[PDB]
Amino acid sequence: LKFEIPVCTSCGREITPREHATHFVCPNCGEAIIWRCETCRLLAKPYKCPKCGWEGP
Amino acid sequence: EYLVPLDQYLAAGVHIGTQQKTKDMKKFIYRVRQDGLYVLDVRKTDERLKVAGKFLARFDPQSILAVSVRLYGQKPVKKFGEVTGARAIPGRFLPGTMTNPAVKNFFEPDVIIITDPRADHQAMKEAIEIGIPIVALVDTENLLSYVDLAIPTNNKGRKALALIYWILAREILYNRGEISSREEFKIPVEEFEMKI
Amino acid sequence: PGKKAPNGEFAGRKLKLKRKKFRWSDIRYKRRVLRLKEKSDPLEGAPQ
Amino acid sequence: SQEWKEYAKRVLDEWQPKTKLGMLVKEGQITDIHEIFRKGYQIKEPEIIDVLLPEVNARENQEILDIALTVRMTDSGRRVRFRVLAAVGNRDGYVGLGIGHGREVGIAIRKAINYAKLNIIEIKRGCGSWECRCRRPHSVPFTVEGKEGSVRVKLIPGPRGLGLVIGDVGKKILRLAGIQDVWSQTLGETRTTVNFAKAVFNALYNTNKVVVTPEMIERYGIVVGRAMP
Amino acid sequence: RNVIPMPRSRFLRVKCIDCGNEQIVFSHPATRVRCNVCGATLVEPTGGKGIIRAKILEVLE
Amino acid sequence: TLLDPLANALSHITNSERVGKREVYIKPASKLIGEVLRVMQKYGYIGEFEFIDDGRAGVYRVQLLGKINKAGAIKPRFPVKARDYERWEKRFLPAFEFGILIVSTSQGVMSHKEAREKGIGGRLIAYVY
Amino acid sequence: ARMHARKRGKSGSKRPPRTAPPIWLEYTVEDIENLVVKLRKEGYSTAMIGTILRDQYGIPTVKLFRDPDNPNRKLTITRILEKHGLAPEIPEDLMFLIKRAVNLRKHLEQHPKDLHSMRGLQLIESKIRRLVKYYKRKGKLPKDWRYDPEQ
Amino acid sequence: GDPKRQRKKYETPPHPWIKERLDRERVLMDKYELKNKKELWKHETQLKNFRRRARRLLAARGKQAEIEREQLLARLKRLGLLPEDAVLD
RNA sequence: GAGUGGUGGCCACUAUUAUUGGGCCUAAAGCGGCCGUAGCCGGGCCCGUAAGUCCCUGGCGAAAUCCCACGGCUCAACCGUGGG
RNA sequence: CCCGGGUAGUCCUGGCUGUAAAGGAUGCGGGCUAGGUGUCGGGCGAGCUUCGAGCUCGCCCGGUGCCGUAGGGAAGCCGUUAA
Ligand SMILES: [Mg+2]
Ligand SMILES: [Mg+2]
Ligand SMILES: [Mg+2]
Ligand SMILES: [Mg+2]
Ligand SMILES: [Mg+2]
Ligand SMILES: [Mg+2]
Ligand SMILES: [Mg+2]
Ligand SMILES: [Mg+2]
Ligand SMILES: [Mg+2]
Ligand SMILES: [Mg+2]
Ligand SMILES: [Mg+2]
Ligand SMILES: [Mg+2]
Ligand SMILES: [Mg+2]
Ligand SMILES: [Mg+2]
Ligand SMILES: [Mg+2]
Ligand SMILES: [Mg+2]
Ligand SMILES: [Zn+2]
Ligand SMILES: [Zn+2]
Ligand SMILES: [Zn+2]
Ligand SMILES: [Zn+2]
Numbered sequence A: 001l002k003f004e005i006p007v008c009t010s011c012g013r014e015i016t017p018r019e020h021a022t023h024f025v026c027p028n029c030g031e032a033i034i035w036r037c038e039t040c041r042l043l044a045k046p047y048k049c050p051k052c053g054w055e056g057p
Numbered sequence B: 001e002y003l004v005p006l007d008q009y010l011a012a013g014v015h016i017g018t019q020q021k022t023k024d025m026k027k028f029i030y031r032v033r034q035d036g037l038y039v040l041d042v043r044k045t046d047e048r049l050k051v052a053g054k055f056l057a058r059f060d061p062q063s064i065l066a067v068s069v070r071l072y073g074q075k076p077v078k079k080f081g082e083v084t085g086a087r088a089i090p091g092r093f094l095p096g097t098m099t100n101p102a103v104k105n106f107f108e109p110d111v112i113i114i115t116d117p118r119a120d121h122q123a124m125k126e127a128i129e130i131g132i133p134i135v136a137l138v139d140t141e142n143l144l145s146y147v148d149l150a151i152p153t154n155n156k157g158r159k160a161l162a163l164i165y166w167i168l169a170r171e172i173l174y175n176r177g178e179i180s181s182r183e184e185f186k187i188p189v190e191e192f193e194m195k196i
Numbered sequence C: 001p002g003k004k005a006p007n008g009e010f011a012g013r014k015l016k017l018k019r020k021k022f023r024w025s026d027i028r029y030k031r032r033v034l035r036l037k038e039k040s041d042p043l044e045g046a047p048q
Numbered sequence D: 001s002q003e004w005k006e007y008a009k010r011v012l013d014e015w016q017p018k019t020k021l022g023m024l025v026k027e028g029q030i031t032d033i034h035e036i037f038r039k040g041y042q043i044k045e046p047e048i049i050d051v052l053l054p055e056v057n058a059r060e061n062q063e064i065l066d067i068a069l070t071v072r073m074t075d076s077g078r079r080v081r082f083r084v085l086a087a088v089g090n091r092d093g094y095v096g097l098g099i100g101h102g103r104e105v106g107i108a109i110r111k112a113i114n115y116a117k118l119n120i121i122e123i124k125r126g127c128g129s130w131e132c133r134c135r136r137p138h139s140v141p142f143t144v145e146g147k148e149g150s151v152r153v154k155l156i157p158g159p160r161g162l163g164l165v166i167g168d169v170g171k172k173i174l175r176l177a178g179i180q181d182v183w184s185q186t187l188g189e190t191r192t193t194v195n196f197a198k199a200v201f202n203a204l205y206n207t208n209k210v211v212v213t214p215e216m217i218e219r220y221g222i223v224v225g226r227a228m229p
Numbered sequence E: 001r002n003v004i005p006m007p008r009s010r011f012l013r014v015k016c017i018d019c020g021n022e023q024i025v026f027s028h029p030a031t032r033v034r035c036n037v038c039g040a041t042l043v044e045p046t047g048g049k050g051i052i053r054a055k056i057l058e059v060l061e
Numbered sequence F: 001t002l003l004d005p006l007a008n009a010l011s012h013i014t015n016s017e018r019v020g021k022r023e024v025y026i027k028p029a030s031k032l033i034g035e036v037l038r039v040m041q042k043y044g045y046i047g048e049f050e051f052i053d054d055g056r057a058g059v060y061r062v063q064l065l066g067k068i069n070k071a072g073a074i075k076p077r078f079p080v081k082a083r084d085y086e087r088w089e090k091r092f093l094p095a096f097e098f099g100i101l102i103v104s105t106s107q108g109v110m111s112h113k114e115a116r117e118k119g120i121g122g123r124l125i126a127y128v129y
Numbered sequence G: 001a002r003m004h005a006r007k008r009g010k011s012g013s014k015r016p017p018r019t020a021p022p023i024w025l026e027y028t029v030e031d032i033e034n035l036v037v038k039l040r041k042e043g044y045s046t047a048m049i050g051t052i053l054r055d056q057y058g059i060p061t062v063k064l065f066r067d068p069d070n071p072n073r074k075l076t077i078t079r080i081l082e083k084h085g086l087a088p089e090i091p092e093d094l095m096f097l098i099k100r101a102v103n104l105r106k107h108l109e110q111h112p113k114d115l116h117s118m119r120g121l122q123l124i125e126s127k128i129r130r131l132v133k134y135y136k137r138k139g140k141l142p143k144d145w146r147y148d149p150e151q
Numbered sequence H: 001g002d003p004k005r006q007r008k009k010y011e012t013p014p015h016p017w018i019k020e021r022l023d024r025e026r027v028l029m030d031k032y033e034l035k036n037k038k039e040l041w042k043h044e045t046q047l048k049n050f051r052r053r054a055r056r057l058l059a060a061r062g063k064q065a066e067i068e069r070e071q072l073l074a075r076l077k078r079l080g081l082l083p084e085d086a087v088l089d
Numbered sequence I: 001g002a003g004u005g006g007u008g009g010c011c012a013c014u015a016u017u018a019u020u021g022g023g024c025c026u027a028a029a030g031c032g033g034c035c036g037u038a039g040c041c042g043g044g045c046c047c048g049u050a051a052g053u054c055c056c057u058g059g060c061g062a063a064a065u066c067c068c069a070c071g072g073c074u075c076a077a078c079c080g081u082g083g084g
Numbered sequence J: 001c002c003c004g005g006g007u008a009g010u011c012c013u014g015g016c017u018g019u020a021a022a023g024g025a026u027g028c029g030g031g032c033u034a035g036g037u038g039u040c041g042g043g044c045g046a047g048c049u050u051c052g053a054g055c056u057c058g059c060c061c062g063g064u065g066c067c068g069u070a071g072g073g074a075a076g077c078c079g080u081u082a083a
Helices: A038-043 B006-012 B042-056 B071-084 B121-129 B158-175 C012-023 C027-034 C036-040 D002-013 D020-026 D047-052 D105-118 D168-177 D193-208 D214-220 F005-017 F031-042 F085-092 F112-118 G029-041 G046-057 G077-082 G092-110 G115-138 H019-032 H037-058 H063-078
Strands: A022-025 A033-036 B029-032 B038-040 B064-068 B087-090 B111-114 B134-138 B149-152 D062-074 D077-089 D094-102 D144-148 D151-156 D183-187 E011-015 E022-026 E041-044 E055-059 F023-026 F046-052 F059-064 F071-073 F100-105 F108-111 F122-128
Touching (some): B038 B042, B042 B149, B042 B158, B071 B087, B071 B158, B121 B134, D002 D047, D077 D168, D077 D193, D094 D168, D151 D193, E022 E041, F005 F023, F005 F071, F031 F108, F085 F112, H019 H037
Parallel strands (some): B134 B149
Antiparallel strands (some): A022 A033, E011 E055, F071 F122, F100 F108
C-alpha cells in the first residue's frame, strides 16, 4: 500500500516536499487537523474547521 | 459572558489603536474617531482570548516560547513564563537561536507567541523556517502574513500588555485543569506590569 | 515594444514582406545571393 | 543492500542527535524516508539521510559534477579557493545537489557531498509520451520546465529505450534520480555548469506543482518516491 | 455586489413655498428649476448636488 | 480598444487562479463565453457559474476550485481536419491526453475528444489544462 | 482614452437597469410628445430637451416607452421630432463642430501668430471629416455634400 | 532533378571519441568476434529501424495501420526475436 | 581500416532570420513630436444566405524514385507480385 | 585656462534652414494581477468655526512622488504611472 499526500485546507492543493507549510489541531475543538500551504499563509487566506465550523487565522 | 468586565478592558486601554490601518485588519476595527485614530472591537478580543486559551493548553508546558523585544512587554512575558512554565526570552533575540545547532542556547519550540510582528521580526522569520504554528498579538497597523492565530489588541501599552498576559495565563491554567475555577487564580494583575 | 506583428489570419502578404525585408541584414545570405565572393576571387571558384 | 543495512545500524547506535527531527529518527518514531517531507521540518543533520537512505554513500550513487578554482586579489598576491559542485541520489526517487568550498580540494569535496544530502528532494515519474504508453516509471510523466541564471530547461517525455537526449550534466543528474528516457530543449548559456545543473534540478522539483486527477495517476502510471514492486 | 452600476442621485417630491404646487425634481440639476405654475425658483444648480429652496415631502425610489 | 472578449476572460481566469481567488466576474458576456464555460464545467475545471443582467451586455459570475494549470485563447482560429488533432495537441498540451482543446464545429462548441469521436473538424478557439 | 489628448476621464451617467416606467411617473405618452414638441418649438437642442425633461418635469429618459406606431423599437427624442417634421436637416454634433470651426477661423485672421490655437482648428476639422465619412456611409447626407471652410 | 543514388545501410556515431561508447562497443566486438566497427553499426541500425516502426504505429489509427502492425509482429517473431504471444509494446 | 588524410561548396550546429520560435532603459536597435489615406485588427442580441470553413461521394494529378510483407538470383545490394 | 578691452551675435518685424545626451536613453490603444504612505483638481459625508471662496478627518474619480508582495531580469533594478 502507498501513502497519502497532505492537502491544504484552504485551497485544496498538495504540499510540495520542501515548502514552508504548517499543520496543527483545530484551536476551537481540537478534533481535526488543519493544513496551510506557504501561499495561503503568505496571503493570510482564511480557513474553516471541517467539524466545528470555527474559522479564521 | 466575558472574561473580565468591559470597563476593565477600556481602562487598560486595550481598544486604543494607532493612526494607521491595514486592509486585512479591518475585520477587527470597530470605528474611526474624528482625530483619525482607529479603535478595536473588544468582543472580538475576548472571543479570540478564549480560543487561544483553549488552543495553548494542549501543548507540553515546556515547549512554548514567548518573546518580546519591546521594553514594556519584557516583564509580562517573564511573569507569564514563570506562572505557566513556558520559556520566555525578553530583550534581544540572538539570531540563530532556532536555526543554528552550534549555539549554546539552541532550542526548538512547538509553538511561539509573538508580542509584536514588527518589532520581533527576527524571531518570526526564524519561526517560519521551522514550520511551527504562530500566535501573535496584532494592532491596527500590523499585517497578518504568516500568522496562524491572531489576537487583536493594543500591543504597545503597559497596562494593556499586562492585562492580556494575565488573562492568557489564567485561561491556560483553567483549561489544563490546575485550578478548579476561574476565581481560584489569586495573583494580582499589578504583578505582571513594569513599574515606573 | 508591444506584441509581435502582424498576427492576423489574413495578413500573410505583410508577414512575408517583412521576413524578406529583414533577411538582407544577414551577411551570409547577402554574399551568396549577390555572388560577392566570385567577383573578387583570384582562383575563380576553383579548389586548386 | 546487505552492506547498507548493517552500515545504517552501525551509524544509528553511535549517533547523538542534536535536533528535534534527529531525536524522532533516533527513537524510532520515524522509520521511512518519505515521512520527513511535506510537513515543513528543517533538516540540519546529515546522519538522518544516512540512517534512512544508506545507499547514497555508495560510490556509484555519487557524482562530482564540476571543480573550479577562484581567486581573490590582495597586496600580498592571489588567494586561491576551490568550488566543487556535486550530486547524490538513490537511483530510485530521491536526488540532492550541493556546493562546497575549501582551501584544498578534499575539504571542498567533503563539504559538497555533505550539503547535497541536506538538499535532498523526491520527485514523480511516469510515462506520458505520445508514441509510448506503457505505464512504467521510466521518464517524466509530463512536460516540465525550470530555470536558473540565464538557463532555461524544458523536459519532454520520451519513448522507452530512447536514452537521455540532453547534455552530460543533465544526463548525470537524471540518472541519479532514476530516469532512463527524455527529450529536452534549452536556452541561454549552458556552458555555465552551476546554472545548468540548478535549472535541471528545479525542473525535476517542479513535477510536484502540476495538479492532477486520480484518472491521470492510472493513465500515466505516476509513482512518487520508490517504485515499490 | 457593485457589479451593477447604481446612481447616487435621487428624484424628489417637493412643494412650492409660494404657489403651494407639488412637483417632482432631480437632485443633481444642470439648469435652474422653477415652479411650473408660479415660476419661482425651486433648485439652484452647482458643481454637484443642487441647493433646494422648497420643502421636501418624500424621497422617491 | 477592446478586440476579443474571449481572450480577456481566459487571461483573467488564469491570472486569478494563481493568487487563490475563489470567484471571478467576466464583464462583457456573450453566448460563446457561455458555451466555453459549459464545456469547462463538464470536465470539472470550474464550479457553478451564473448570468447577471445589467442594462449592458451582461456579466458572468464564476466559482473557481483551484484545478487549472493554464488556460488561454488560440489566435488566429486555425481550421483543423478530423484526423489532424495530434500535432495541435503536441503544440499546446503537455501529455498525450492532458487537458482539452476547444473546437467550434458546425454542430456546436465541444472539446476535441468529442469532435474526434464524431469524426468532424472545425476551428480551434481555446486550450485548457 | 481621449481621441487626441490620451487622458482617461471616467465621468458619466450610471443608468440603473429597468424596463417599465416607474410607478410614481404619471405622464402618458401623448403628454410627453406634446412637451417635446413645445420645447423644440422654443428652440432647444435635442440634448437640452432631455435635460429639461429630467430636471423640471421629473421624467427620466423617454426611452422607457414603446413606440406606439412601431412596436419593435423604443421611443427617442429624434424619432418623436421626425414624426412631426421638426427634425434637424444636419446631424446635431456635426452642426455644432462646424459652428465651432467657423468662429475660430475669423479669430485666426486677426491673430496669425497664435499657433497653439491653430492646432485646435486642425483637430476639430479632423473630427468633422471623420463624422462626414460616417454619415455619408449611412445615407444621412447626400453623396455630393462636401465640407469647404471657404463657403 | 537528380536520379537515384544508392545510400549506405548503416549510420556512424555523432562523435568519434566518447569514452563510454568506446568501452561498450569494444566489449561487444571482443565478445562476438566481428571484423570492424561498421559491421557492428550495421546491426545497430537494424534495431533502430524496428523501434522507429513501432513508435510510429503506436500513435496511428486506420485500416493500413493495422495491416502494417500485424506484418511487423509476424516478421519479428519469424526471425525468432519475439515469442509467439508477444504484443507491440 | 582496403582505405585514410588535405582544399573548396551546401545543410545542420544556429531560437546568428525566429509562423511554430528571437530582440530594442543601461549591451546592436522606438522615427524629435503629432494628425491622417490605403492596408491589417475590430463591442452585445435576433433573422436570412451559404463565399470562406467542416463531413460524404464521383473524375484527375504517367512511369521510374520512397515505406511494408511475400517471392527469384547462396543471403544482400538488385529484380518481380500486391498494399500504401 | 586668469586679467583689461572688443566685432558678429544675443533683442524687434517678414522669410529660409529642420538640427540636439530633442533623454523617461522606455511607440501608441484595451483587459487583468497584495498592500502602505505623501501631495494637486473635482465631488460626497461628518465635526468645528472669528461664519470666510475658512479649518480637521473619512471615502470615490483623475493627475503627480516614495517604500514594497507575486512575478520578471545578466544584474543594476522594475513592480496597478510595469521593464
Ligand atoms: Mg594593502
Ligand atoms: Mg533569478
Ligand atoms: Mg535538368
Ligand atoms: Mg558556426
Ligand atoms: Mg539574439
Ligand atoms: Mg521617441
Ligand atoms: Mg531617440
Ligand atoms: Mg463582434
Ligand atoms: Mg462553402
Ligand atoms: Mg507514379
Ligand atoms: Mg534463393
Ligand atoms: Mg529476400
Ligand atoms: Mg521494382
Ligand atoms: Mg530636455
Ligand atoms: Mg495616483
Ligand atoms: Mg518597488
Ligand atoms: Zn493553500
Ligand atoms: Zn474545530
Ligand atoms: Zn513508456
Ligand atoms: Zn409655485
